[PDB]
Amino acid sequence: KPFVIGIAGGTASGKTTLAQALARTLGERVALLPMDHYYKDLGHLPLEERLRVNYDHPDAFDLALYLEHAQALLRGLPVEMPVYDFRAHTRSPRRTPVRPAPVVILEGILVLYPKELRDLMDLKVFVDADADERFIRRLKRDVLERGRSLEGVVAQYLEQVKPMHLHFVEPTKRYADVIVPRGGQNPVALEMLAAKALARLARMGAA
Amino acid sequence: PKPFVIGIAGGTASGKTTLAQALARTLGERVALLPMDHYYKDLGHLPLEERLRVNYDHPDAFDLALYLEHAQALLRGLPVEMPVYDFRAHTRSPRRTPVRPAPVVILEGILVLYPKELRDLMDLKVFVDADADERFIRRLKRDVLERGRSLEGVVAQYLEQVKPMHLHFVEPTKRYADVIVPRGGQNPVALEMLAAKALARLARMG
Numbered sequence: 001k002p003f004v005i006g007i008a009g010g011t012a013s014g015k016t017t018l019a020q021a022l023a024r025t026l027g028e029r030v031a032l033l034p035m036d037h038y039y040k041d042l043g044h045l046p047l048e049e050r051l052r053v054n055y056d057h058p059d060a061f062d063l064a065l066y067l068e069h070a071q072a073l074l075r076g077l078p079v080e081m082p083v084y085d086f087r088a089h090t091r092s093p094r095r096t097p098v099r100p101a102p103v104v105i106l107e108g109i110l111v112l113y114p115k116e117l118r119d120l121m122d123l124k125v126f127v128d129a130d131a132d133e134r135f136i137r138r139l140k141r142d143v144l145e146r147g148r149s150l151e152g153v154v155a156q157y158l159e160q161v162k163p164m165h166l167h168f169v170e171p172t173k174r175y176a177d178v179i180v181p182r183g184g185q186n187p188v189a190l191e192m193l194a195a196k197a198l199a200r201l202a203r204m205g206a207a
Numbered sequence: 208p209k210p211f212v213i214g215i216a217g218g219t220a221s222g223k224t225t226l227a228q229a230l231a232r233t234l235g236e237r238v239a240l241l242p243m244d245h246y247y248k249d250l251g252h253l254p255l256e257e258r259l260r261v262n263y264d265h266p267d268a269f270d271l272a273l274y275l276e277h278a279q280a281l282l283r284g285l286p287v288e289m290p291v292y293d294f295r296a297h298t299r300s301p302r303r304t305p306v307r308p309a310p311v312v313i314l315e316g317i318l319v320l321y322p323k324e325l326r327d328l329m330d331l332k333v334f335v336d337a338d339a340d341e342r343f344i345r346r347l348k349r350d351v352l353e354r355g356r357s358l359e360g361v362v363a364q365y366l367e368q369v370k371p372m373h374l375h376f377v378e379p380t381k382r383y384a385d386v387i388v389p390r391g392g393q394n395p396v397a398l399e400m401l402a403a404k405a406l407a408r409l410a411r412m413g
């Protein structure tokens with residue numbers, strides 16, 4: 001049985017980085033599935049309509065698919081992970097191979113919302129950061145990498161990302177076993193999580 | 208070598224004591240526990256009324272010198288005579304309890320993360336989080352059930368001292384935390400995580 005780690009947290013909280021650093025520390029032994037790339041394929045709709053969608057509401061996510069893949073890896077099967085194109089606002093034509101592994105990291109802003117996802121997790125983590133600090137990174141990433149305007153980001157954040165976060169994301173902190181501050185730069189928490197996983201991996205091999 | 212030093216702070220009644228004991232219990236006879244809440248400055252010379260007015264949530268109320276001395280001695284592989292605080296009498300007791308050195312040292316208390324000098328000694332800084340309302344429930348059940356406190360007394364001490372000093376001194380130390388731990392009283396996962404970190408540090412020292 002693969003050690004399942006659930007990593008949730010607000011947008012730009014450091015959960016992507018934390019997840020990757022943990023993935024990098026265990027090498028070939030981890031499969032990382034970012035739920036933030038599993039938005040429903042709305043490619044058949046005009047840009048005007050893909051731009052109105054609230055991408056922070058659980059309904060914007062293809063939970064069916066995400067869970068299908070989470071369960072495939074749990075049975076030692078690989079998946080063709082979809083890739084969301086954040087610049088064009090649609091499911092990209094690009095796919096990415098994710099091989100099964102003894103450690104599966106389920107990372108995303110809402111990976112702790114559906115009970116179906118929680119039941120698959122051995123360790124549930126919430127990466128904590130104050131919205132002001134997170135907004136700074138959100139804005140930077142959006143203007144530098146996603147073709148987003150200054151006004152567009154503020155608008156999106158205030159009428160969507162934020163209220164959705166307070167109402168959906170943030171409450172899932174109650175389901176967390178451990179809370180990680182400064183997810184992006186916390187070598188101590190990283191080591192402890194690696195150690196936790198290393199111990200479980202040892203239980204897999206040892207008998 | 209050098210012992211693994213874990214700091215466990217949090218508000219009053221957050222679970223910091225139970226988590227500290229659970230971790231100590233699990234690691235067996237390989238841990239030394241120093242509850243800073245038993246290191247209040249000895250004030251037995253003062254009259255009871257004076258002792259009842261002291262703000263026991265302010266930094267100046269703690270004998271950090273003694274605490275730091277005991278922390279340094281334990282790190283140098285030396286046992287210590289830990290003072291025992293009497294909460295019913297509101298004064299340090301004349302008798303102390305011995306605490307032997309160990310490969311794992313736990314420094315637990317509401318303000319263990321406040322002094323810059325205590326943090327420097329810590330390898331892993333932990334903060335047990337629990338909402339103020341919930342913490343107040345337990346703090347209130349305990350004070351009346353085992354500390355001879357009146358219902359009115361607990362409320363006055365909380366609103367006038369415990370709460371203000373928490374927002375001002377305690378809560379902010381959460382910024383120094385390497386990891387935050389919710390439900391410190393019954394969190395098996397977080398315990399196996401903390402234990403996992405300790406065992407690896409024990410592996411590194413011998």
Ligand SMILES: Nc1ccn([C@@H]2O[C@H](CO)[C@@H](O)[C@H]2O)c(=O)n1
Binds near residue numbers: 086
């Ligand atoms: N087309 C999309 C889809 C998602 N997002 C933002 O991504 C965050 C989760 O990664 C969510 O916080 C969401 O706001 C976005 O800007 N545009």
Ligand SMILES: Nc1ccn([C@@H]2O[C@H](CO)[C@@H](O)[C@H]2O)c(=O)n1
Binds near residue numbers: 244247293369
């Ligand atoms: N004589 C004393 C001394 C301290 N305390 C309370 O103990 C808590 C720290 O465990 C602190 O929260 C502090 O208020 C107490 O109730 N009575």
